Amino acid sequence: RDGRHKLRLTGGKKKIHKKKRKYELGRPPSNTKLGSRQVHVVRGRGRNYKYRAIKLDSGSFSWPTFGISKNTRIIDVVYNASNNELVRTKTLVKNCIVVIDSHPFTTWYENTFGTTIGKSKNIDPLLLEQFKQGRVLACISSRPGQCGKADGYIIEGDELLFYKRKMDKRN
Amino acid sequence: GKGIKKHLKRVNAPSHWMLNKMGGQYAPKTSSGPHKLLESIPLVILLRNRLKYALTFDEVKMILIQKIVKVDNKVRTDCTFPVGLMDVIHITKSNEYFRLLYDIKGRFVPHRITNEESKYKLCKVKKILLRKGRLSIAVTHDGRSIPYIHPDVKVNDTVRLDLETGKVLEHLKFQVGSLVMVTAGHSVGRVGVISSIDKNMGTYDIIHVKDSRNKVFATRLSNVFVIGDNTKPYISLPREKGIKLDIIEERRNRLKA
Amino acid sequence: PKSYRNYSKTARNPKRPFEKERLDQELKLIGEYGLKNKREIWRVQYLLAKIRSAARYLLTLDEKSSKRIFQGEALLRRMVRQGLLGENEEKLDYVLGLTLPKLLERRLQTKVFKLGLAKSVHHAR
RNA sequence: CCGCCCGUCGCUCCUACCGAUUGAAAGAUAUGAUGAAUUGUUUGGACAAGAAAAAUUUUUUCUGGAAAAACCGUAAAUCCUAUCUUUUAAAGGAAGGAGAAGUCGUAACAAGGUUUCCGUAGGUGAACCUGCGGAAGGAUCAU
RNA sequence: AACCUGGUUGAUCUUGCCAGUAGUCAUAUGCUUGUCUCAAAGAUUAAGCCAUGCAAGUGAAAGUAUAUAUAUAUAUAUGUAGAAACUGCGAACGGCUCAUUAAAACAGUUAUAGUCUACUUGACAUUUAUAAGGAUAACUACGGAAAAGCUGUAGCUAAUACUUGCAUUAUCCUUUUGGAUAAGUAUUUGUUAGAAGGAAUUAUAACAAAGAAGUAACACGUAAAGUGUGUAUCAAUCGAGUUUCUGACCUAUCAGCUUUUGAUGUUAGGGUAUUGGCCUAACAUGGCUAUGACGGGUAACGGGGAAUUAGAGUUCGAUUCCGGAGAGGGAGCCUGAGAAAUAGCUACCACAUCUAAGGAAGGCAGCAGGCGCGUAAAUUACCCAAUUCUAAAGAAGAGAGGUAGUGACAAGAAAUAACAAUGCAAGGUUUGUAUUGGAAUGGUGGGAAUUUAAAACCUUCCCAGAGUAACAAUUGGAGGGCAAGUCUGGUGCCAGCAGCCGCGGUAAUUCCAGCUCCAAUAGCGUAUAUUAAAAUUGUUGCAGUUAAAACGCUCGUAGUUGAAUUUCAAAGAAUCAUUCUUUUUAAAAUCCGAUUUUGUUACUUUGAGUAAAUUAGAGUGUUCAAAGCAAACAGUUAAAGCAUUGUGUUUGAAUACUAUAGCAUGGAAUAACAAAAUUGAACAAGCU
RNA sequence: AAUAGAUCCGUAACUUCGGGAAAAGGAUUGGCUCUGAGGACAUUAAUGUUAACUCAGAACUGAAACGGACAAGGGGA
């Protein structure tokens, strides 16, 4: 399933021998969606248990500017750098964009410093407006098909502007 | 299936094991242990063809089940146990100690060792790994992970090991006066004090080492063993004393008798 | 599954087997030595040509060569042990210059003949 | 030289080639179609165990779950078309080679009786003849 | 041993091939065969089909033990064992065959800073307790069919099978000592710091979130405290997967191939034990090629290796070992650390078994053996004694493996006689030579010793056992090559022989025979393939006016090949008359009269990794040898060496090679490349 | 009777090299939610007024079926 029966770089055919071994394997992909927190376990070679996430709802999400992370829940998926039906069918991947909650981070802000380590960092007015709306975007960085959890980081700054302008000279 | 191979052909055995042609077809494949298969030898041929103590694999197995064999003051029943490059083997009731060293011919040979010297063993560390808690361990050629080495000890420095207490005693560096010995070179069996090190950019470090009889020969850094300083060899060398007498004059010495 | 007993030949066929000068020469020698058949008087030239080519390898090597003065005595010890020629000869040219009947002379069939026992070489054999 | 020899035509034998037969046979590659089995996911849903009530029975709840179905996925095997590879059936055709005192002719070897030869073109039963332009390997190294 | 001879002609010299010649571990086959050692053996074609029987199992302190049996003082405590069965490991090793395979496999050389890793070894750990809960075999009882290495319910028990769960440590302050602070291992995500390597986003440390799998609810008994089994992690072990750089046979009557069906690459993501078009989506039009791509063929597994060689080279390499593949053809899958496994399964195709007709089971390219094919290939034997593997690791297994049978595949040693005399021939009282007559030896028969898991073979001792040593050697020829016949008879262009030239019409040196001789001899012919011969493939090393062969001529790209020129030289010690060694002689930075580096590559010198077998070779008297890697030394029984009474000693299994590719390395020459004036520098002063 | 329009793909023998040819042979077109892309008019590299029918892939859908009627080659040796 891996590394053969392809064309040679010169364009010629490489006719097959060495009928498929097991260490190449190539297990079918797993599509994680919104649902209850149920996962499966797959046995990879050498007795390694892989945490296959078939449907996820919540995970760890980290504020990079404050260097913190808390557990919260994803409600929707809006975009991925890959194809579009992947996000239209509510799948999660290691660079997808999701919509993250605002209230737990707001409570962390209130308890740590207040106001509506390395504190006093001025944050960002657009992020504060998003928090006021209560619907803040984030980018998932963990690999749900491998690790089985959706660990993301809060998107900010110039990258936030880039991901926002491509969405809304726009429709 | 194509799993881990568990057979060794007699003709495929390492040369210094020295298995004959007509004495079968399979060689005793050393079980997984502290040293390589190619450069270490098992108890079977150590006790059958080197010590000439036994005559048949059944009789070799008949010996080790009685706990009358000890390596590093530790009992081992594994029949195909790789002894290692140099160690401290001990058979109890006969009150004798064999240490394994090299020959001028470049072989493995049991060497008579007294009790006090057999209490003295050396290990060449291969690399240092520091684990959680900022503690340091060194892995030796003996397949031993000795933790908490002296800070001055480096990747090439060797450490005196007290087998009974399992602790390091004295470090030995790699200076120009660091008397060493060749392990896996084509110049195996030559003991030398090193002349200079020739570091090369990102490839195996070839170093020149100087013999007692004023012969300079080079070998990779990977197959050197510091066995003492310029004062004297810390380990009793074999009869040949590690000095490679030349093949031309070997013959006149054998002719005279 | 294969017997590791290496085996080799000892005699090589002369090639062009119908030359009268060599046929008469080998008949003369087999008559002077009372031998059995041509396999024996073809094995001996195989032996002496083997050692002869070995020595001729050393002659091509220059003087003071570590290889020259290794086989120079390695071969010469065997030659003086067999007793091909006396003590007056020491040189690699001198061991190069051997003939065939002097190689036969070391055979046990005629040593007893020359030491007595039998009044004929056929009797000794 | 009463030498040597050429071709056509006769007879016998052998080899290869062309060959209609939508050639056939056989194999091997891409396409399309069908698609057994089967990994994974979803839908299940024989119960076997737990939570409740009465002093042998029942509803509801939570997991593990067997047959079975759908989906992408791996894909055997079979069939359509297209291509590549190997023999041969093949009526028959046209050759070549060999054997062989056969027939006719004089083609070349001498200035072979018409010097020989090339290329091209045409004719002729055949070797051959003829024209055009060349060569001497000519029969001339030479007013 | 770097080799030639016959054949074109009336005769000669050439070119030229045919034939001759020898080797083959290269196969078949004809004739013959007294011995011993040694031992190839269904590769060639059908990776065709298989009857049959076997080829993987395992318990000796240590998992479970009321099937049961036996012994210690009295139903009492221990035991010794233990069928079956649960559990654990292995069965993924090994053995076989070479279909497929053409930058694939392999080999050498790299990386994995892109990964996994059972058993073993060494270190070491984090968020009811005088010991917790179920789930079940074997087994009792009823059967089914013809059956499976088949099976249903009722009832029970365990274990090291399955499942829950019983502290404590470190850090900060007065500063031994009192308080306080804090408690997640791998793994994953976001933010900082950061002993080595060659380069870390390294080891590791800190902060904020998740976070499995554990730290023994287990069994045996050694110092005059221990072990097995099992558990989290790190490292090696035994390995494996990817992977760099280099190397391959023939073919152009294969020139342009790949790209919508991934082709070349980027991004992003899935998937893998991990990188990667491995896969998907978007994006870009790229990538290889006469230095031969893309195709085709191979009667092609690859490698070290084999034959042949003066050196070159040529051919072979299924086959002892290594790497790859497959188990009638594809494909899929669980298990397990490890299989896309076949004496594991599933489905299709082609065969094929039992059959009560319902239905079950199959893969000898494992070992013997059969059929089919073919020129071509062993016994349906014995044994784990030798080596080595599995296990719960001594006594059990292993068609692995050994031993034995057949075996003129090959290889090595070696019988079928010698001796005194007359007579004869030669010769100056010597050699050879139809007779007597006796010594000695085997083969052979037997008994024994020895030998082997058992027997036989080998060897040693004793009796019969050779005179035509009746205990009898053959194969191919006798024209030339090419040794041995115009010796004798049959035939007579017939029969025949003859690798080539040739012989055969009455005198056949060639046919058919007899005698003899010749070459080799327990071996010699025949056929095919291959090597040298062949300087008839020619780099060394061919030929081209007329023998074959200069394109009709010229241009011209790829290719091949390419003027000269840059640092000379001088002085001193040692052998034989020379040869050999040493020192310096401009300029730039380095050391306070002096300390020292001053283009790249090819090439060339040395080294490090250079599997074993095989190759040449050392040493070693298997009776020599093929061998093999041993053995030798004084010892009618003791001396020395040494140990503060006894304890053997010396030893050997080296060496070169393991490309041409890669690493380091000395380097004056020879070669190329750059720097060199449509302007380019160095130094000094000053400016930013 | 069998398709037969259009678009995209593919197209042999033979040949007078022009053809054969609509060769042969395939796929799509249905329905809708879509989307996107390809001219003239003006200001000191950019932003405003105003007129196409050609392509494309993701959906879902509807009775796995569509040039929906009309109109419109059967091919091959």
Tab-separated table of C-alpha atoms (C1' of nucleotides) in Angstrom, chain F residues 15-57:
chain	number	residue	atom	x	y	z
F	15	U	C1'	-5.227	5.101	-50.127
F	16	U	C1'	-4.546	8.393	-55.863
F	17	C	C1'	-1.943	11.060	-49.168
F	18	G	C1'	-6.823	14.533	-50.896
F	19	G	C1'	-9.606	10.757	-47.992
F	20	G	C1'	-11.647	6.605	-45.584
F	21	A	C1'	-14.482	9.351	-41.126
F	22	A	C1'	-20.232	10.839	-38.453
F	23	A	C1'	-15.217	4.957	-39.454
F	24	A	C1'	-15.687	1.541	-35.500
F	25	G	C1'	-16.532	2.588	-30.397
F	26	G	C1'	-17.430	5.233	-25.586
F	27	A	C1'	-19.210	9.075	-21.762
F	28	U	C1'	-22.390	13.197	-20.677
F	29	U	C1'	-26.860	15.916	-21.305
F	30	G	C1'	-32.014	14.783	-16.469
F	31	G	C1'	-33.589	18.617	-11.699
F	32	C	C1'	-32.107	22.181	-8.894
F	33	U	C1'	-28.693	25.121	-4.767
F	34	C	C1'	-24.237	27.017	-6.494
F	35	U	C1'	-20.200	29.421	-7.550
F	36	G	C1'	-16.646	31.466	-10.346
F	37	A	C1'	-14.131	33.317	-14.942
F	38	G	C1'	-13.619	35.883	-20.404
F	39	G	C1'	-16.303	44.228	-23.757
F	40	A	C1'	-17.399	49.722	-24.352
F	41	C	C1'	-17.670	54.528	-21.120
F	42	A	C1'	-12.562	58.344	-16.406
F	43	U	C1'	-9.293	60.485	-12.723
F	44	U	C1'	-3.897	61.718	-11.222
F	45	A	C1'	-0.689	52.057	-10.211
F	46	A	C1'	-5.658	52.519	-8.675
F	47	U	C1'	-10.843	53.039	-7.791
F	48	G	C1'	-17.073	54.418	-10.527
F	49	U	C1'	-21.761	54.027	-15.251
F	50	U	C1'	-23.077	50.235	-18.574
F	51	A	C1'	-24.271	45.603	-22.933
F	52	A	C1'	-22.257	37.890	-23.709
F	53	C	C1'	-23.097	32.489	-23.550
F	54	U	C1'	-18.943	29.435	-23.346
F	55	C	C1'	-16.458	26.499	-19.580
F	56	A	C1'	-15.634	24.196	-14.800
F	57	G	C1'	-15.775	21.233	-10.228
